[PDB]
Amino acid sequence: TKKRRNNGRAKKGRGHVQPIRCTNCARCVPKDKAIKKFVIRNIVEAAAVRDISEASVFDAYVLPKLYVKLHYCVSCAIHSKVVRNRSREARKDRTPPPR
Amino acid sequence: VRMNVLADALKSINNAEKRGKRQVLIRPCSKVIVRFLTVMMKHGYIGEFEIIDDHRAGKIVVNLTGRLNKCGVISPRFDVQLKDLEKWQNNLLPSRQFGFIVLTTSAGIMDHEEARRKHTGGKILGFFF
Amino acid sequence: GRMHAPGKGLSQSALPYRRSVPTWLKLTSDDVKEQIYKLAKKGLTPSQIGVILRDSHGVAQVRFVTGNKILRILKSKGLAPDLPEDLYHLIKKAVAVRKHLERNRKDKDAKFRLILIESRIHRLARYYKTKRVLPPNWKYESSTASALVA
Amino acid sequence: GRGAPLAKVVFRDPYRFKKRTELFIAAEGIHTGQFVYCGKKAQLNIGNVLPVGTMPEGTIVCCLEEKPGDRGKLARASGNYATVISHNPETKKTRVKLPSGSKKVISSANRAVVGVVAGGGRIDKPILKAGRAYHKYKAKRNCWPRVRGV
Amino acid sequence: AKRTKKVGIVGKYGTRYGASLRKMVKKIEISQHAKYTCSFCGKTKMKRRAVGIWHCGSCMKTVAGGAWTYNTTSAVTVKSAIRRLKELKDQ
Amino acid sequence: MRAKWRKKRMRRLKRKRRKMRQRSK
Amino acid sequence: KSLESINSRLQLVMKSGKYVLGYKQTLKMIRQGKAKLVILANNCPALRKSEIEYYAMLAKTGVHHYSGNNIELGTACGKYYRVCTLAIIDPGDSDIIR
Amino acid sequence: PLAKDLLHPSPEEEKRKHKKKRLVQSPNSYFMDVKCPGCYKITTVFSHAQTVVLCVGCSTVLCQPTGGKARLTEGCSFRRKQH
RNA sequence: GGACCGGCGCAAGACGGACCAGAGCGAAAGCAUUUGCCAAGAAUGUUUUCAUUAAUCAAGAACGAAAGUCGGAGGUUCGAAGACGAUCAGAUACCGUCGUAGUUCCGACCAUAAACGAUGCCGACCGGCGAUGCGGCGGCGUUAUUCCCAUGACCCGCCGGGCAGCUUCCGGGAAACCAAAGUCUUUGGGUUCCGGGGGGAGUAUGGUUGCAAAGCUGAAACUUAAAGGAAUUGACGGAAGGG
RNA sequence: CGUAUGUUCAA
Ligand SMILES: [K+]
Ligand SMILES: [K+]
Ligand SMILES: [K+]
Ligand SMILES: [K+]
Ligand SMILES: [Mg+2]
Ligand SMILES: [Mg+2]
Ligand SMILES: [Mg+2]
Ligand SMILES: [Mg+2]
Ligand SMILES: [Mg+2]
Ligand SMILES: [Mg+2]
Ligand SMILES: [Mg+2]
Ligand SMILES: [Mg+2]
Ligand SMILES: [Mg+2]
Ligand SMILES: [Mg+2]
Ligand SMILES: [Mg+2]
Ligand SMILES: [Mg+2]
Ligand SMILES: [Mg+2]
Ligand SMILES: [Mg+2]
Ligand SMILES: [Mg+2]
Ligand SMILES: [Mg+2]
Ligand SMILES: [Mg+2]
Ligand SMILES: [Mg+2]
Ligand SMILES: [Mg+2]
Ligand SMILES: [Mg+2]
Ligand SMILES: [Mg+2]
Ligand SMILES: [Mg+2]
Ligand SMILES: [Mg+2]
Ligand SMILES: [Mg+2]
Ligand SMILES: [Mg+2]
Ligand SMILES: [Mg+2]
Ligand SMILES: [Mg+2]
Ligand SMILES: [Mg+2]
Ligand SMILES: [Mg+2]
Ligand SMILES: [Mg+2]
Ligand SMILES: [Zn+2]
Ligand SMILES: [Zn+2]
Incomplete structure (x- = not known):
């Protein structure tokens, strides 16, 4: 039984897409199939951001952010709860979960 | 093509x-x-x-x-003799009450009933009913 | 679609219904046919000759002005090419591809395109031989074809 | 006895009206009637002889002097060459890569022939016959055949 | 008519030496004896005189080349590289 | 048994069978 | 561009113009003042190339150095033999004299 | 729309449809009367010209080929010809 | 005997991140730093040219991931094999420390992949909608091109060729689903390959190709009443979510 | 981190 119309990946009008290595297990996964997650977050967590403020030498020093792009294989994405199973019709929904 | x-x-x-x-x-x-x-x-x-x-x-x-109901062509244009015309009618038409088989005969392009009247066989073109 | 490509393009010329010559054309049939002779003698292919006449002289269709197709006009005057232009241009392309392969023998794509080009040459030459346009024994000799074209 | 060709090169003598004939290791590509130039101000061409100091980094050379003025000791066998790696203008020294893979520091006044030694690929051919080996060493020295010590 | 199926030029060695050695030497055996097109005069009369020496019987030009071919891939690569480096020393 | 390994099993079996005939010819 | 133009224009001369293919004939035509253009293959002997250039300078005509050897200059002329030098006496329908 | 009149479509409908797909095919191109600012004579130029049209005698560029309709030179007035 | 870590510098070989998309190109395989050169190509545009030259294809031919093979160069990284350390009842594994072949370049082989859209190609017809990439055409306005001009960036449309998407009681289908997998008992546009219960078996054997590994062609004896597809309800799960 | 298995027929 076919489960997904796009076969679980974003490859439509090409033959081969270069693989990439999973962030957790380093498994080879096609770039179009990898569950991607561009993580932007402050270098200092919200708990410690206050301490760094009065520890700083600058009057108004904005905390730099951390930009990490994660690529996940299907097993690691499911295991790490990045994605979950969905129902027959819930699978077809493509909009990202609300902020 | x-x-x-x-x-x-x-x-x-x-x-x-x-x-x-x-x-x-x-x-x-x-x-x-x-x-x-x-x-x-x-x-x-x-x-x-x-x-x-x-x-x-x-x-x-x-x-x-x-x-x-349907206007369909027959390919290839088989040669249809008068004796074999009845077996073509039983195979292509829903009933004898209506529907026609269009034949190209030497006399001209005509339906199967006119061909039977003019006693001419020919090559089958199509049908409609 | 294309015989040697997956393309199904439709781009082409839509010839108008009215075949009559417009009133604004002052060029007579003979005058147009003499202008054809200058361009062909200048070394232009029938295809090209039509463009110069259409672009700068208002001759939409030489056939409409003169009653004869350009190549047919050139045959009467004896200016017709020895090799048909379409066949000539396919041979010219094959020579250029074959020149590239001698110095780029890792170009497996150029090897693939060449087989296609030579396939069209043979299909075209088979047609010309049937209508008796090429001698009954004209063969494309990839080795000796470089001298024919350019 | 040598797998590399030699070139008879004729130079004018600077001090006497007389021609001087020099026997060179033939850099691959040189031909009879070609002019070859030797000096500090010679141009970077195959067969020219230049000090390694004036050569740019990555130059491929052959018949390279091991010491300044020794008239050529390095990379002389057929198909071998040396590479200029780097220079030290302060110490007048040059680093080269020898055919063995060893890197050697030599004076920048060491001369060499630009290019590789002709006759390369000689060892690619299987000798096949004991007789061909016999003729090979008959021109070199009495070192063949070899009896096992055991 | 076609006289040999595969051995070709190395059919002179008979059943001796081993198929692999005969196959390996075949390519060298062909290119060593081939006549190449002289660049100086255009005639296909450049043939090997000695190992690494090539001579044209028409323009009487002698060229230092490869052991088994007129020029080796190493030589043509070096000549291109030397031509570039010459430009770098110049403007 | 996995089909890929059933194929590998038979390939090894064939190689043995060819050695058994090359020894008798 | 230039290489495409020169072969196409040279092909026009071979069917409509007056020309001589060869070295001796070229010197004959230059001497008579009949040569309009002289074309030299790139592998022309250096002495021959220099001599023809001197001949053309005296005759006050033009020399074009072809971008091919005598093999490809011959193929450009449509002939099955090598052509090292040639002279054009009558351009014919082409415009190689530009 | 089940009952669409195919015999007599609107001229707007035909003008939109592809030239080959019209009820009776017609070109979208035309000829034009081009007048360069210099001289006085008029040149007939195809709309989708492929060659650089030169005003003979005047020796000026009138249009440049493009991927579609030729681009008239600046200062050149054109008027569509009628047949 | 100074590991790791920090700084400077050097060498080698591999790789081309992010931008990178259900985007493009290619017959597929596949293709991603800059610049140059070489030849090629689809689409679009065309009142150019030829005039049926076409479609599909037994034989035949070119290309064909990865692994593998042969000769040469190179060998960072990873890493079959192997060694070892763990884990375990065992562990010839999963985990870890090394590490050969290989991985890389050049040249010759090999011809297979879930080589997949598990869906031949060429042609026609059959609903709608928002996009998108390429080409062309039209049109308020914004911006740069200093002003004009055109040209680019954006906006609103149309046409053509393409990768797709959403919706639909077009219609089909065993259903999953499919705008094709529709226009099929109301059965015929053309044409190629190919299946006929499950096994035995892609095995044997003969031929052929290959350096080899193998590729291609390809049976029979015998055995068997199911094997299988899609979907339903339950049960189960070292699946998730909420109690 | 780390474990495997469950004789034949029978509603
Ligand atoms: K360090
Ligand atoms: K579109
Ligand atoms: K179930
Ligand atoms: K029982
Ligand atoms: Mg499943
Ligand atoms: Mg589905
Ligand atoms: Mg995915
Ligand atoms: Mg085309
Ligand atoms: Mg075809
Ligand atoms: Mg077109
Ligand atoms: Mg001895
Ligand atoms: Mg020994
Ligand atoms: Mg011994
Ligand atoms: Mg990059
Ligand atoms: Mg076949
Ligand atoms: Mg092949
Ligand atoms: Mg491979
Ligand atoms: Mg490999
Ligand atoms: Mg190897
Ligand atoms: Mg162990
Ligand atoms: Mg390791
Ligand atoms: Mg298969
Ligand atoms: Mg694939
Ligand atoms: Mg299949
Ligand atoms: Mg086909
Ligand atoms: Mg595109
Ligand atoms: Mg049927
Ligand atoms: Mg069966
Ligand atoms: Mg067999
Ligand atoms: Mg199945
Ligand atoms: Mg047990
Ligand atoms: Mg028990
Ligand atoms: Mg049980
Ligand atoms: Mg019971
Ligand atoms: Zn993973
Ligand atoms: Zn010569």
Whole structure:
């Protein structure tokens, strides 16, 4: 039984897409199939951001952010709860979960 | 490529008929197409049609009366003898009460009943009912 | 669609219904046919000759002005090419591809395109031989074809 | 006895009206009637002789002097060459890569022939016959055949 | 008519030496004895005189080349590289 | 048994069978 | 561009113009003042190339150095033999004299 | 729309449809009367010209080929010809 | 005997991140730093040219991931094999420390992949909608091109060729689903390959190709009443979510 | 981190 119309990946009008290595297990996964997650977050967590403020030498020093792009294989994405199973019709929904 | 203009025309009429359209554009046009359409007109299965001259193969616009059940072509154009005509009727027509088999005979393009009357066999073109 | 490509393009010329010559054309049939002779003698292919006439002289269709197709006009005057232009241009392309392969023998794509080009040459030459346009024994000799074209 | 060709090169003598004939290791590509130039101000061409100091980094050379003025000791066998890696203008030294893979520091006044030694690929051919080996060493020295010590 | 199926030029070695050694030497055996097109005069009369020496019987030009071919891939690569480096020393 | 390994099993079996005939010819 | 133009223009001369293919004939035509252009293959002997250039300078005509050897200059002329030098006496329908 | 009149479509409808797909095919191109600012004579130029049209005698560029309709030179007035 | 870590510098070989998309190109395989050169190509545009020259294809031919093979160069990284350390009842594994072949370049082989859209190609018809990439055409306005001009960036449309998407009681289908997998008992546009219960078996054997590994062609005896597809309800799960 | 298995037929 076919489960997904796009076969679980974003490859439509090409033959081969270069693989990439999973962030957790380093498994080879096609770039179009990898569950991607561009993580932007402050270098200092919200708990410690206050301490760094009065520890700083600058009057108004904005905390730099951390930009990490994660690529996940299907097993690691499911295991790490990045994605979950969905129902027959819930699978077809493509909009990202609300902020 | 297009191997049979008549097949393309009859299929195009059949699809528009099923879709409830009132007019269908037929391209390209041929004497065999026009003679076939005339046979359907004389029996009321289609309305008036206007061949359109483009200094090319031609285009036709047929008025559909919502009466055709199916206008299908037979490929290849098998030779049909008078004795074998009955076995063709039992295979191509829903009943003998209605429906016609269009034959191209030496006498001219005609339906199967006119061919039987004129005692001429020929090559089968198509059918409609 | 294309015989040697997956393309199904429709781009082409749509010839107008009216075949008559317009009133604004002052060029007579003979005058147009003499202008054809200058261009062909200048070394232009029938295809090209039609463009110069259409672009700068208002001659939409030489056939409409003169009653004869350009190549047919050139045949009467004896200016017709020895090799048909379409066949000539396919041979010219094959020579250029074959020149590239001698110095780029890792170009497996150029090897693939060449087989296609030579396939069209043979299909074209088979047609010309049938209508008796090429001698009954004209063969494309990839080795000796470079001298024919350019 | 040598797998590399030699070139008879004739130079004018600077001090006497007389021609001087020099026997060179033939850099691959040189031909009879070609002019070859030797000096500090010679141009970077195959067969020219230049000090390694004036050569740019990555130059491929052959018949390279091991010491300044020794008239050529390095990379002389057929198909071998040396590479100029780097220079030290302060110490007048140049680093080269020898055919063995060893890197050697030599004076920048060491001369060399630009290019590789002709006759390369000689060892690619299987000798096949003991007789061909016999003729090979008959021109070199009495070192063949070899009896096993055991 | 075709006289040999595959051995070709190394059919002179008979059944001796081993198929692999005969196959390996075949390519060298062909290119060593081939006549190449002289670049100086255009005639196909450049043939090997000695190992690494090539001579044209028409323009009487002698060229230092490869052991078994007129020029080796190493030589043509070096000549291109030397030509570039010459431009770098210049403008 | 996995089909890929059933194929590998038979390939090894064939190689043995060819050695058994090359030894008898 | 230039290489495409020169072969196409040279092909026009071979069917409509007056020309001589060869070295001796070229010197004959230059001497008579009949040569309009002289074309030299790139592998022309250096002495021959220099001599023809001197001959053309005295004759006050033009020399074009072809971008091919005598093999490809011959193929450009449509001939199955090598042509090292040639002279054009009458351009014919082409415009190589530009 | 089941009952669409195919014999007599609107001129707007035909003008939109592809030239080959019109009821009777017609070109979208045309010829034009081009007048360069210099001289006085008029040149007939195809709309989708492929060659650089030169005003002979005047020796000026009138249009440049493009992927579609030729681009008229600046200062050149053109008027569509009628047939 | 100074590991790791920090700084400077050097060498080698591999790789081309992010931008990178259900985007493009290619017959597929496949293709991603800059610049140059070489030849090629689809689409679009065309009142150019030829005039049926076409479609599909037994034989035949070119290309064909990865692994593998042969000769040469190179060998960072990873890493079959192997060694070892763990884990375990065992552990010839999963985990870890090394590490050969290989991985890399050049040249010759090999011809297979879930080589997949598990869906031949060429042609026609059959609903709608928002996009998108390429080409062309049209049109308020914004911006740069200093002003004009055209040209680019944006906006609103149309046409053509393409990768797709959403919706639909077009119609089909065993259903999953499919705008094709529709226009099929109301059965015929053209044409190629190919299946006929599950096994035995892609095995044997003969031929052929290959350096080899193998590729291609390809049976029979015998055995068997199911094997299988799609979907339903339950049960189960070292699946998730909420109690 | 780390474990495997469950004789034949029978509703
Ligand atoms: K360090
Ligand atoms: K579109
Ligand atoms: K279930
Ligand atoms: K029982
Ligand atoms: Mg499943
Ligand atoms: Mg599905
Ligand atoms: Mg995915
Ligand atoms: Mg085309
Ligand atoms: Mg085809
Ligand atoms: Mg086109
Ligand atoms: Mg001895
Ligand atoms: Mg020994
Ligand atoms: Mg011994
Ligand atoms: Mg990058
Ligand atoms: Mg076949
Ligand atoms: Mg191949
Ligand atoms: Mg491979
Ligand atoms: Mg490999
Ligand atoms: Mg190797
Ligand atoms: Mg162990
Ligand atoms: Mg390791
Ligand atoms: Mg297969
Ligand atoms: Mg694949
Ligand atoms: Mg398949
Ligand atoms: Mg095909
Ligand atoms: Mg595109
Ligand atoms: Mg059927
Ligand atoms: Mg069966
Ligand atoms: Mg077999
Ligand atoms: Mg199955
Ligand atoms: Mg047990
Ligand atoms: Mg028990
Ligand atoms: Mg049990
Ligand atoms: Mg019971
Ligand atoms: Zn993973
Ligand atoms: Zn020579």
